Design a protein around this ligand. Structure first.
Ligand SMILES: *[C@@H]1O[C@H](CO)[C@@H](O[C@@H]2O[C@H](CO)[C@@H](O[C@@H]3O[C@H](CO)[C@@H](O)[C@H](O)[C@@H]3O)[C@H](O)[C@H]2NC(C)=O)[C@H](O)[C@H]1NC(C)=O
Ligand SMILES: COc1cc(-c2oc3cc(O)cc(O)c3c(=O)c2O)ccc1O
Ligand SMILES: *[C@@H]1O[C@H](CO)[C@@H](O)[C@H](O)[C@H]1NC(C)=O
Ligand SMILES: *[C@@H]1O[C@H](CO)[C@@H](O)[C@H](O)[C@H]1NC(C)=O
Ligand SMILES: *[C@@H]1O[C@H](CO)[C@@H](O)[C@H](O)[C@H]1NC(C)=O
Ligand SMILES: *[C@@H]1O[C@H](CO)[C@@H](O)[C@H](O)[C@H]1NC(C)=O
Ligand SMILES: [Ca+2]
Ligand SMILES: [Zn+2]
Length: 768
């Protein structure tokens, strides 16, 4: 009859099945001579030998069978499983919801740009930004190889495409075995090797069969058994693409996912591995709803479209004739004619070096230089001629956030953790495998709060240049600076306020550097300039401060030379002219001190940096009105700001012998960006200075130092209400500023180094 011929089509066990004896055509045995031969449905002991299912159990507290001396780690990926699915539909997914309940669960996991599967899947297993491992999109063109990249093409298995070191190679190079049941890269001969066991991708393999195979790798003899295995399924990405994120169709793809995870967990409890295996359940990206009333056509911006265009949520544009006009293609011209042509364009045009530095999406020959930052739910296509959902957007968008759930003896129990970025997962996986990670872009130790016994303890970065000294001196014999200050009558007296005694310097350090001065992790000849209201590290290598830090409380033409800075290591007033695009802007705004003698502490050559006049518009307005409002909102702020030189857009500080771009007829380098880090405290009944380091709140900006405000299309507005909106898409991690400057912040905080590392990896986000 029917319920003893479904054994050939069903991967579960019903009650009338147990004790059935061998048929040839059974996918899964439900015999009693079953276990001994290692081939039973996960629910066998749950429904027949009346044991309690894993899902019904209570979550026991802090193991493994005999041959398992180290906990195996399973990496489970459900493509396109956006974080909101778990927030809205966990009710419908009892097994996934148990993981959330008793394992370690993050609010969401940030993907990398572009938020596509091969990009993020390889990123997860290498811990590298897409710009570095090379898989920068599912479809790419490399000019050096003159080769196309595609999932349905064959060049996808050419190892020249795949950089870095995936986790499975890391596992094998240090004595463990790894088996991947589908993972982007696992079929490629990266570094001349495969995983210890891998599976040719066949999308038609049923999810249940994949779960059975992973559970049959764990039944192998100890000498052959893999220590790390991945498991991959295409839902809810496949159905999410066709029917959209809010759909009944996705709700039952999501229940199919819950079925398969539960299958895995039931089979694990059968083997007494359920409190042994370390399980990470994540996704590569999210899902966003699209429409055809939400298409942007390049024909509405060009008359002739003689360029190739990777379309969708993350578009790029290159020449149609490659490889011969690849370097010639006028990339800036396409960006400029896509710049503020209509008042309500649902995208913005960028060259790769102008992309928000937080994305880390330049510095790869495959990253074509024309790029489009498309608004959510819209797509950018070339022509006029779509439904359901897609992905690829900016990874700040709520629809792009991925789930991250962990379970096992190596993780904490029933713990909720803050958001983190998937680039952090590679390190965390080698910790659970007791492996030394290959170099990557995670901040090793920042995910330690997830682990029950952290395997790696971070140690502070060694300072690479201690400060020199710039002592107090007389005013030079002539004043060749070209600086003039009508207002000053007793020059000797006001210059004395820059000559504080040693304890007066301490008191200011206690006020303006409450977390310790930043350590310099490059080479830099610099001194420390103490004033009562601000402290700077002035570098003779770049004729300006490396950083300027000051502290403000909730509410709050004269320029001369710094007698501590030698003339040759100085900026002078005459370096800047009124028929030049660059004007001296201030790091510490003089308007913040009370005027009279305290204001003169900020009106010196040691407190100015070269600024495009239209950037100083943005810069001054932020300090003018925006910064004092954030101060009342957050109850005071510790501010630290300075220049960034990244002319080759690698995300790292430029060494000084690399800087070519000076201002006309001088030796003053033009920064590519300026950073601003604002530290307050979550519990705002406290100030930036009396806060437990564990409740610190950080907000950091890296502003593109650009000659126009084309990005905001605000070169002819009679206001500055546009500035806050553009600054809010140029936030960054403190870590991002550290990389771009060669500085190391927050060293003197009185808390474990791993806890500070969470603060530096935090990313401020404003898209609500
Ligand atoms: C993300 O992590 C990776 C790995 O730690 C970083 O990649 C490393 O980047 C540096 C410079 O970008 C590379 O060194 C350079 O090698 C080139 C040869 O192509 C040479 O011309 C330079 O003088 C320099 O020595 C290094 O090879 C590279 N390592 C790997 C494994 O790719 C990357 O910089 C990190 N990204 C960020 C934003 O932190
Ligand atoms: C709708 O089609 C999909 C295809 C895939 C897909 O995944 C892969 C994973 C691999 O490790 C290797 C592959 O070749 C693929 C692949 O080709 C593929 O189409 C993924 C998600 C989908 O929604
Ligand atoms: C790669 O594919 C594009 C199609 O967009 C084509 O223009 C180009 O000539 C191809 N290059 C090679 C080397 O196949
Ligand atoms: C490539 O393999 C060699 C050993 O054959 C190893 O020493 C090296 O670290 C590997 N390189 C990468 C980038 O994984
Ligand atoms: C793909 O998998 C299905 C089920 O596992 C199998 O029947 C089919 O033959 C496979 N196809 C290929 C081309 O391997
Ligand atoms: C902030 O700290 C004070 C203790 O000084 C406490 O009374 C207050 O409840 C805290 N605010 C919180 C926990 O939100
Ligand atoms: Ca650099
Ligand atoms: Zn997809």
């Amino acid at each position: 009859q029917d319920i003893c011929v479904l054994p050939t089509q069903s991967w579960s066990c019903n009650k009338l099945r147990c004790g059935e004896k061998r048929m040839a055509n059974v996918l899964c045995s439900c015999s009693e001579d079953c276990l001994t031969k290692k081939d039973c449905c996960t629910d066998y002991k749950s429904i027949c030998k009346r044991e309690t299912s894993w899902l019904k159990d209570q979550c026991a507290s802090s193991q493994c069978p005999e041959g398992f001396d180290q906990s195996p780690l399973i990496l489970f990926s459900m493509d396109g499983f956006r974080a909101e699915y778990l927030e809205t539909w966990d009710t419908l997914m009892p097994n996934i919801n148990k993981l959330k309940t008793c394992g370690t669960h993050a609010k969401y996991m940030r993907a990398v740009y572009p938020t596509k599967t091969f990009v993020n899947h390889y990123t997860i297993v290498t811990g590298l930004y897409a710009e570095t491992h090379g898989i920068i999109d599912n479809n790419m063109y490399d000019v050096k190889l003159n080769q196309n990249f595609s999932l349905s093409g064959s060049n996808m298995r050419n190892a020249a495409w795949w950089g870095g070191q995936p986790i499975w190679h890391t596992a094998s190079y240090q004595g463990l075995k790894a088996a991947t049941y589908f993972w982007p890269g696992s079929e490629v001969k990266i570094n001349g090797s495969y995983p210890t066991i891998y599976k040719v991708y066949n999308k038609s393999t049923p999810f249940e069969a994949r779960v059975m195979e992973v559970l049959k790798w764990l039944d192998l003899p100890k000498a052959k058994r893999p220590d790390f295995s991945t498991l991959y399924i295409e839902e809810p990405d496949t159905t999410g693409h066709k029917f959209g994120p809010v759909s009944g169709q996705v709700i039952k793809s999501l229940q199919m996912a819950d079925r398969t995870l539960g299958m895995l967990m039931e089979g694990l409890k059968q083997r007494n591995l359920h409190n042994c295996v370390n399980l990470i359940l994540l996704a590569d990206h999210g899902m966003e709803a699209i429409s055809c009333n939400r298409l942007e056509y390049m024909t509405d911006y060009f008359n002739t479209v003689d360029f190739f265009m990777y379309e969708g949520a993350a578009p790029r544009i290159r020449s149609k004739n490659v490889p011969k006009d690849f370097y010639t293609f006028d990339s800036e011209a396409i960006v400029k004619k896509l710049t503020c042509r209509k008042p309500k364009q649902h995208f913005k045009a960028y060259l790769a070096k102008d992309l928000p530095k937080r994305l880390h999406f330049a510095n790869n020959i495959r990253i074509d230089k024309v790029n489009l930052m498309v608004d959510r739910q819209w797509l950018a296509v070339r022509n006029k001629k779509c439904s359901g959902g897609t992905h690829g957007y900016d990874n700040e968008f709520k629809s792009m956030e991925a789930i991250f759930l962990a379970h096992g003896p190596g993780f904490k129990e029933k713990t909720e953790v803050t958001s983190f970025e998937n680039i952090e997962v590679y390190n965390l996986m080698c910790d659970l495998l007791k492996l030394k990670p290959a170099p990557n872009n995670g901040t090793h130790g920042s995910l330690n709060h997830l682990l029950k016994n952290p395997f790696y303890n971070p140690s502070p970065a060694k300072e690479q240049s201690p400060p020199l000294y710039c002592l107090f001196g007389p005013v030079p014999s002539p004043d060749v600076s070209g600086c003039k200050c009508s207002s000053i009558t007793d020059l000797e007296a006001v210059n004395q306020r820059l000559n504080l005694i040693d304890q007066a310097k301490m008191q200011s350090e206690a006020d303006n550097l409450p977390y310790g001065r930043p350590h310099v992790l490059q080479h830099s000849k610099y001194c420390l300039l103490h004033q009562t209201k601000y402290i700077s590290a002035y570098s003779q290598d770049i004729l300006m401060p490396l950083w300027n830090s000051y502290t403000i409380s909730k509410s709050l033409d004269c320029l001369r030379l710094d007698v501590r800075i030698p003339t040759v290591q100085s900026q002078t007033c005459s370096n800047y002219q009124p028929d030049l695009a660059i004007t001296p802007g201030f790091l510490y705004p003089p308007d913040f001190s009370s005027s009279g003698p305290e204001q003169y502490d900020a009106l010196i050559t040691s407190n100015i940096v070269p600024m495009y006049k239209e950037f100083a518009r943005l810069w001054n307005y932020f300090h003018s009105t925006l910064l004092p409002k954030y101060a009342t909102e957050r109850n005071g702020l510790n501010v630290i700001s300075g220049p960034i030189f990244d002319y080759n857009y690698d995300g790292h500080f430029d060494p000084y012998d690399t800087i070519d771009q000076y201002v006309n007829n001088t030796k003053i380098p033009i920064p590519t960006h300026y950073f601003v880090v604002l530290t307050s405290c979550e519990n705002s009944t406290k100030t930036p200075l009396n806060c437990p380091p564990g409740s610190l709140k950080v907000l950091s900006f890296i502003l593109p130092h650009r000659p126009d405000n084309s990005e905001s299309c605000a070169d002819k507005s009679p206001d500055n209400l546009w500035v806050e909106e553009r600054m809010q898409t140029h936030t960054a991690r403190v870590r991002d500023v550290e990389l771009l400057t060669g500085l190391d912040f927050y060293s003197a905080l009185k808390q474990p180094l791993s806890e500070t590392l969470r603060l530096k990896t935090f990313l401020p986000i404003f898209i609500n």
